[PDB]
Every structure is written in structure tokens, then in C-alpha cells.
Amino acid sequence: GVLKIVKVYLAVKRRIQPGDKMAGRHGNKGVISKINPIEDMPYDENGTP
Amino acid sequence: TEFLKPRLVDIEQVSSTHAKVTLEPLERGFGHTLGNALRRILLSSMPGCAVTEVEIDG
């Protein structure tokens, strides 16, 4: 019936943004409310945030 | 590279109580670099006058 079929393959990267549900392994769910700039990050004596 | 300049400031005033400064525009963490700054400075780095000692007498 359909002698010629053309299946297209698109490609779309979907990144990480505020609103995506993320969790862990030990059963700790959650949703990122607002991915903030590394400038608001609490750092230790070292400086590494 | 292109930088931006702070402008438009709403001096919302009520006699001697409070003034509320509304400045636009700011960027990723500029409302912080500005706000936090004024706070600590207005607390332990601002000259002013006040009573230090009060000897009644007796």
C-alpha cells in the first residue's frame, strides 16, 4: 500500500532548567525551584563553593 | 564586551521615616553586591553622634 516510507530522525538537546524534577537514590525527590548563579554559593574556609 | 550603566532611580519619600530607592537595571547577583554592601557599611562603618557616657552625679 505504502510503497515508499520516509522516517525522519530529528535531534534536540534538552538541558537542565528550573522546573525539572530531580532526586537521588535513597528516596529523596524534589524539583529545582531556581538554579542560582554560583555567586550565591556558601563556601568553606577553602574557597570552593 | 559591553557594560551597562545604573539609571532611573525612584526616590519614594515620606517625611523623615523612609525613602525607598528603586534603581534599574541590575544583573545576576548585582542586587546582592549592592544591597549587602550598604548594610554592613551603615552598621559598623558609618560616622554619627550619640551619647557614650552619662554621669548623673550621686
Tab-separated table of C-alpha atoms in Angstrom:
chain	number	residue	atom	x	y	z
A	1	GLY	CA	0.000	0.000	0.000
A	2	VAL	CA	2.624	2.459	1.209
A	3	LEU	CA	5.411	1.656	-1.266
A	4	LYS	CA	7.702	4.445	-0.046
A	5	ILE	CA	8.141	5.346	3.632
A	6	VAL	CA	10.417	8.125	4.920
A	7	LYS	CA	11.128	8.065	8.669
A	8	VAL	CA	12.937	11.250	9.737
A	9	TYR	CA	15.380	11.462	12.649
A	10	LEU	CA	15.405	14.855	14.363
A	11	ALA	CA	17.836	15.778	17.148
A	12	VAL	CA	17.000	18.056	20.063
A	13	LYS	CA	19.168	18.612	23.121
A	14	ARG	CA	17.104	19.373	26.206
A	15	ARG	CA	19.158	20.779	29.066
A	16	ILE	CA	18.654	21.219	32.811
A	17	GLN	CA	16.456	24.138	33.837
A	18	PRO	CA	14.393	25.484	36.792
A	19	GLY	CA	11.324	23.265	36.981
A	20	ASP	CA	12.771	19.824	36.243
A	21	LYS	CA	12.107	17.102	38.826
A	22	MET	CA	15.407	15.770	40.192
A	23	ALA	CA	16.225	13.427	43.085
A	24	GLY	CA	18.737	10.889	44.380
A	25	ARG	CA	18.951	7.191	45.264
A	26	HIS	CA	17.836	6.997	48.915
A	27	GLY	CA	14.312	8.115	48.023
A	28	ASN	CA	14.779	11.889	48.125
A	29	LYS	CA	12.687	13.547	45.406
A	30	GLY	CA	12.253	17.213	44.570
A	31	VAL	CA	12.103	19.855	41.841
A	32	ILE	CA	14.674	22.560	41.137
A	33	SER	CA	12.915	25.784	42.095
A	34	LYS	CA	15.540	28.226	40.842
A	35	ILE	CA	19.033	27.205	39.687
A	36	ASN	CA	21.051	30.084	41.139
A	37	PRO	CA	24.397	31.531	39.962
A	38	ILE	CA	27.479	30.091	41.682
A	39	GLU	CA	27.892	33.575	43.176
A	40	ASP	CA	25.324	32.869	45.912
A	41	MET	CA	27.011	29.606	46.912
A	42	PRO	CA	28.142	29.209	50.565
A	43	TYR	CA	31.827	28.252	50.576
A	44	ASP	CA	34.084	26.859	53.306
A	45	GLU	CA	37.427	28.167	54.565
A	46	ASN	CA	38.968	26.874	51.322
A	47	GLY	CA	37.021	28.968	48.834
A	48	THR	CA	35.442	26.089	46.941
A	49	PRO	CA	31.696	26.776	46.964
B	1	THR	CA	32.453	43.381	25.590
B	2	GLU	CA	29.611	45.718	26.556
B	3	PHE	CA	28.823	47.005	30.049
B	4	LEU	CA	25.619	48.622	31.333
B	5	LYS	CA	25.066	51.728	33.463
B	6	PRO	CA	22.756	52.166	36.520
B	7	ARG	CA	19.966	54.701	35.888
B	8	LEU	CA	16.342	55.590	36.709
B	9	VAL	CA	16.075	55.934	40.495
B	10	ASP	CA	12.685	56.380	42.190
B	11	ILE	CA	13.161	58.486	45.298
B	12	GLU	CA	9.980	57.391	47.080
B	13	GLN	CA	9.832	59.778	50.040
B	14	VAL	CA	7.771	60.112	53.227
B	15	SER	CA	8.941	62.948	55.522
B	16	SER	CA	11.610	61.579	57.901
B	17	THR	CA	10.617	57.894	58.118
B	18	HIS	CA	11.790	56.194	54.942
B	19	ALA	CA	12.966	56.711	51.388
B	20	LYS	CA	12.833	53.758	49.006
B	21	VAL	CA	15.347	53.722	46.157
B	22	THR	CA	14.230	51.905	43.001
B	23	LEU	CA	17.108	51.585	40.519
B	24	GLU	CA	17.119	49.760	37.179
B	25	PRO	CA	18.748	47.716	35.808
B	26	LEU	CA	20.822	45.054	37.586
B	27	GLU	CA	22.221	41.609	36.675
B	28	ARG	CA	22.973	38.122	38.037
B	29	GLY	CA	23.822	38.967	41.638
B	30	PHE	CA	24.050	42.747	41.394
B	31	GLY	CA	21.119	43.356	43.721
B	32	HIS	CA	23.256	41.466	46.212
B	33	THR	CA	26.646	43.097	45.630
B	34	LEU	CA	24.804	46.387	46.148
B	35	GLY	CA	22.361	45.614	48.947
B	36	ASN	CA	24.641	43.670	51.262
B	37	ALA	CA	27.302	46.366	50.822
B	38	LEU	CA	25.192	49.250	52.145
B	39	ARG	CA	24.020	47.160	55.122
B	40	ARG	CA	27.368	46.340	56.748
B	41	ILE	CA	28.646	49.855	55.995
B	42	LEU	CA	25.642	51.600	57.554
B	43	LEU	CA	26.186	49.438	60.651
B	44	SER	CA	29.881	49.319	61.665
B	45	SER	CA	31.494	51.923	59.372
B	46	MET	CA	29.216	54.978	59.422
B	47	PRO	CA	30.133	58.180	61.329
B	48	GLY	CA	27.470	59.690	63.568
B	49	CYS	CA	26.895	61.124	67.036
B	50	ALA	CA	25.438	59.583	70.195
B	51	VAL	CA	25.802	59.561	73.982
B	52	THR	CA	28.683	57.442	75.272
B	53	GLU	CA	28.590	58.189	78.995
B	54	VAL	CA	26.148	59.666	81.495
B	55	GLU	CA	27.311	60.639	84.964
B	56	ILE	CA	24.226	61.581	86.947
B	57	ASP	CA	26.269	62.752	89.935
B	58	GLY	CA	25.471	60.782	93.076
